[PDB]
Amino acid sequence: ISKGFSTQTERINILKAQILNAKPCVESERAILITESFKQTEGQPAILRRALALKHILENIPITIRDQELIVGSLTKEPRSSQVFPEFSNKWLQDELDRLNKRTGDAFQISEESKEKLKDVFEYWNGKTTSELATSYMTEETREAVNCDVFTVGNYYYNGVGHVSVDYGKVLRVGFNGIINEAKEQLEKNRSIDPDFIKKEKFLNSVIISCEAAITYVNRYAKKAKEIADNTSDAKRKAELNEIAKICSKVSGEGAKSFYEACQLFWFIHAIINIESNGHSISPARFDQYMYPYYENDKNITDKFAQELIDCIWIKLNDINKVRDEISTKHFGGYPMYQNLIVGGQNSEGKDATNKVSYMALEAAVHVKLPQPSLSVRIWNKTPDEFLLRAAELTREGLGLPAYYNDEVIIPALVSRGLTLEDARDYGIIGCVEPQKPGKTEGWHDSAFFNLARIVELTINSGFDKNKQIGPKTQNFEEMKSFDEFMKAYKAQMEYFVKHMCCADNCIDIAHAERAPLPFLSSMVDNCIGKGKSLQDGGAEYNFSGPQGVGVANIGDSLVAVKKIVFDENKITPSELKKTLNNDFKNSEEIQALLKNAPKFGNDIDEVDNLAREGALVYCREVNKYTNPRGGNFQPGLYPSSINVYFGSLTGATPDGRKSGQPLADGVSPSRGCDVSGPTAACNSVSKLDHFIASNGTLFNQKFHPSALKGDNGLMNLSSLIRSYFDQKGFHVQFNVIDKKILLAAQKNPEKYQDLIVRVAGYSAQFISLDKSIQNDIIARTEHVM
Amino acid sequence: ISKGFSTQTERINILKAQILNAKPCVESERAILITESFKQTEGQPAILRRALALKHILENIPITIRDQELIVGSLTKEPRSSQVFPEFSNKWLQDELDRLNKRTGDAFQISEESKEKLKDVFEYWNGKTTSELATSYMTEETREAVNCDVFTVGNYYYNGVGHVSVDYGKVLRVGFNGIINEAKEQLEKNRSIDPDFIKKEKFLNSVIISCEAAITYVNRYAKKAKEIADNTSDAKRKAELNEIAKICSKVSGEGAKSFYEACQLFWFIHAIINIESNGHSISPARFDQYMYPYYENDKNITDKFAQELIDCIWIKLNDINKVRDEISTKHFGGYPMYQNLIVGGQNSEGKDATNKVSYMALEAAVHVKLPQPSLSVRIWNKTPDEFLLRAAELTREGLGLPAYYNDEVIIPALVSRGLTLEDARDYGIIGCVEPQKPGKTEGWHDSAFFNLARIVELTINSGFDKNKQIGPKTQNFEEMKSFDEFMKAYKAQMEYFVKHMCCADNCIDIAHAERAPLPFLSSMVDNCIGKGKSLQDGGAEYNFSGPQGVGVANIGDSLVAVKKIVFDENKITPSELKKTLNNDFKNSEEIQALLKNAPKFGNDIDEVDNLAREGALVYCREVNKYTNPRGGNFQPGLYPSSINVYFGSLTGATPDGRKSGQPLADGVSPSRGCDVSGPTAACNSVSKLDHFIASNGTLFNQKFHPSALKGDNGLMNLSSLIRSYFDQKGFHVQFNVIDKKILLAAQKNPEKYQDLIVRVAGYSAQFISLDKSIQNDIIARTEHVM
Fold this sequence. Notes:
2 copies of one chain form a homodimer. Chain A has 786 residues and is of the alpha/beta class. The first copy, chain A, has a single domain, classed as Anaerobic Ribonucleotide-triphosphate Reductase Large Chain. Helix content of chain A is 49%, strand content 7%. Chain A contains 32 helices and 15 strands. The first copy, chain A, is globular and about 80 Å long. Chain A starts with 9 loop residues before the first helix and ends in a 7-residue tail after the last helix. Chains A and B meet through helix 6, helix 10 and helix 21 of A and helix 6, helix 10 and helix 21 of B. Chains A, B: This is Glycerol dehydratase. Chains A, B: Keywords: Lyase, Organic radical. Chains A, B: One of its GO terms (molecular function) is lyase activity. Chains A, B: InterPro entries: Form_AcTrfase_GR_CS, Gly_radical, GRE, PFL2/GDeHydtase_fam, PFL_dom.
């Protein structure tokens, strides 16, 4: 049955309004502070410079407690804003200072004072960032390949890494004091005359300095609270502020005991990670698993208050923001932080792990209705029916939540990559769809985006592009007599560019280790303290690197068109197709129609579905060949964030009939309007791809007309649709359930739809914050009925 | 028979005068240039910054050709001067700017303009030197131990490492082009997707840039020579300059063919090493072995011209200088560079290797009569009588040359340390007395000086010094009942301080690898190119670290006095001795007499000789426990440069009767005036020490009255003396043969004795350039007769 959802407290409505009414801006406090610290630590090893910088930032960064907050800790004075991280890159900011407020979507405000104060920042960091060192490590040939419009490694180049779920459970138990004591104990075990312990010693002392700074940070809020309380007339709020001061004072260094304490300490851990570095996809992961014990053992708290606290955490997760350069902003549209939080699933012994907090998380999504966190649910053979149905009820709300993940495929895929069965069973999701064992991994889950469609274009043009030979000079398409020769050339182009993408990633990897090893973050991930080395230096138990392929449906549809129309039926010659594509079908609409009418991916047609599979596998097999400086293996993923639109604008006409400059397909979803046989047939098609090899994750989007989810049958049908796709070995699926008229109305009168949330790809966003190009891509997606 | 020596050409007299008439100063060109370069390579890996800096320096450093020179290449405009190396340290220079010319010995001039230009240098390098990073890596306990007046690790802390004999022979054969080609071949062999090759690729390309810069440097002299030739009227000199231009143009990339070419290329290799870094002890080593082939195959050169060219090399070796801070200057007095050049010995087959150049080297020492190079000879069982007698003839000249080394102990000692028998047989000496296989070693042969006498002082005072517990709190001397308890405490004090000295050395080791890896030097030492790693990063086939113990005779004489006077005969109680030493024998000359009359080292008395041996072994055994960051073992040495005087000034009264502040003994030589049984008895005593374990070398000084070497009998006696010491496993021996009246006269009227040369310890120096304290220590040494 459909029970519906409860109503959130007025407090939640007030806090939510603070987020939406905010005017996202760029603040300079952090930038000024890290610059000041580095100027004083020139003769110190990088790890200590990082620890002392975090200390200086945490001791002097402005503190803020917003009205009516129960959970405190704000990274910026203005809500939903961003600090600056000049240690990674900053010249892009220097260039865009005067046009940040002129953007359509993802606009940021910045004061004249901030622009002025940043001048010295740009001056000091010149040549001292991770981005600049990364480029120096790259060969000239790699630099050229990086700038050929085939792939981008900008994510970890311009900003921090992130993409990790730390051991939140451990810190909640032992507190910052517990971590410090573990570091001190290791220091004693390491007492030795062996030279190798010299650097380990510096790392362990850097962890101590960092955690001591965290304790100081929390204490500043404890003092701030009392200060505000003493100046508060309202007895109720005054009592609240005094309780906050009390909780902050305890969890400043000690572990949590009660649920309120666990919630507040959780946020401080999460918040401070975001102060040390701006890598995104800092994912809470299995929140329901590590938070439940505190809820269950709290014999005084009521469910209503426990739920209100969770709602507050949901709101806080929407307070964090991150400014990016104008190009990268096209890759990550809608002020996204990608903080994935997942509930449900099984435990290490293979038994169901659903609990009370699992359901409270689902409830919170409806109470708050904001883009973050990226709520997800794990599904397996023994998922309780009531759990899946409750998730279905949430999907009916039209927030794009929750994302569904398949334990049956993910667990085996992870064990295949080296995780123990116990660790694989305890997986959580990073960012959009990247799985990992929390607290034991440095996965680099979004190290790059690779345009698969461009490889098809370069195959047809023999590596020649814009009157320049950017790729290998493979066999001239005009001379090919078989589809086999085509696939060989395709593989040759793929091989060349994947090689340089992975090499570029490795250079950026080395740069982060050399200039930005992270003491605080590393202390909360296994073996780092025990090994006496940072995450950047390979301290994690598990190490990977994960680059994404974009354009799967376009490749399958293009490959089958080439094979059928050109080589099998000989309707047109290779020369004719090459010329038609290079002219964007000008005066050859009859040829384009032939291509458009060829079999399309997403209709359960094996002929094309198997080519989408093989086309993607060529990319995946190349990625698997590489290893990173941390001794880990590269693993491919197939998701696009919002880059399918941008990549499309840089891609010429393709054999599937798509015109030049048009968006590519998102994730492994069928191309727009191509899936005309119903959602089940579409699911069947997508399930044919190899979701096991793409262990960094694959993303499948489906959009339903609201009528499809109506009533109990609607929930039953969605549930059946999901189970069938997962039984067929699909990796992930998520759904948009909205009235198309509402999206169109939002474009015309944004002001009237500030709270409208929509699913982009692996994350949801405030529709009006998205660039029109992305809004239109979402509106153009196929709309299904059950 | 005494052959006598030939007379050098007038040209040699003119060139020699340029050295002696020069006014040693500090120039700023190099410092300004390296600063310019580093400011432009901030985003480059350290190895490339080093290669690009060398390139900038070599392309823009002033070039100078001195009048009448046949071999060209000057590091400074003024002869016998020094450039500045701010990358290692510079604040000491900033502090001493106005008192460098107020020094008595080792004085340096510096223009007001240079002082002005260095202001920006000091500003830029603040916190960016190797010295500052080294301190950061040291623990607080180590920093304190380093400043307790027990040992010093300043050599590699304030300046470059050096202490190496590169593969001169290889470069003479293949030229800089050959080295570049080898790096390019390795680059091709390394083509791979493995991330580990990224850093190797940068190293190899740095070698290429560095060697290409070397070629450019040589071509600059080629052009300069021709320019000077065009403004030279004298036909003879004009032809000389045109020949120089011709030779430089060839060896500017190609290997040498003629002897003149080999001599010029040799100097360029040596000179450029001294531009990249200022570590001293850059030693030519077996010059006679790699230069002889070019002499023998040169069918046109006359012996007189070949000799004149060698004489020119000798003078060029005296043109290089290095300014050091006030304190360090006390450790290395007399403008020393310690460039050891050795001749004679056996080859890898175990056959004698004496040749014509071996003899021309001995002749050159008499033709030039300057402090450099530090000429040495190898002696073994089958050394030709003619060779040893010729070396004896040179000793009679009274220049302190040559130093004699014993193959019979050195070869086994080296194999014991890991060298193959073939490599050990091909050893050369580094600096003062440190053996190594040239072209395959990174030995850090003078990483520290350790005051052994202070350990005795601290044993008596239970680690308490200057009202502070600086060492371990060992058993109170007053409560000791046996000499065994004393020796146990002695070992405990030794253990503590040696541990921190080696740890401090390792921190400096890491700092050099992190901030000053050397591309040029590394290219000429084996496995570096093949391994794709610098010398600082462990690329050498053989790796070691070598700290020196100072005060051997003082320890032996002190230990036997404690054992006999206190514990054996009970003449005085431990308390009485402790009090008298702390009072520097004030009002207790009867007790000092007792100590002075105890058996002394150097008289062939086993009771004391065995304690000098055991005392030194306690130090040696502690040093052997350590390893460096390059995977090599520490090996002890027993030599003092000129630091025995300075160390003595920091040491209180000792049990041997020596008063507070007096100089300590030099190397393993007996204390002044203590060896009263003749030189043979002295040699017998010294031979009882373990010269095999002290593989970093031991130094033995003896001084004879001129009458002792008179006539053929004198030479025969000196020869017999040396062979007897070596047959007993002595490591090295050298002799001063001069009239004491001459030394005293030189102190009263310096300008009258500008060309007077004297042996200090492992090196000879212009007597008048030495501080009076060092002059007096030399004058006070025991004077023997056969």
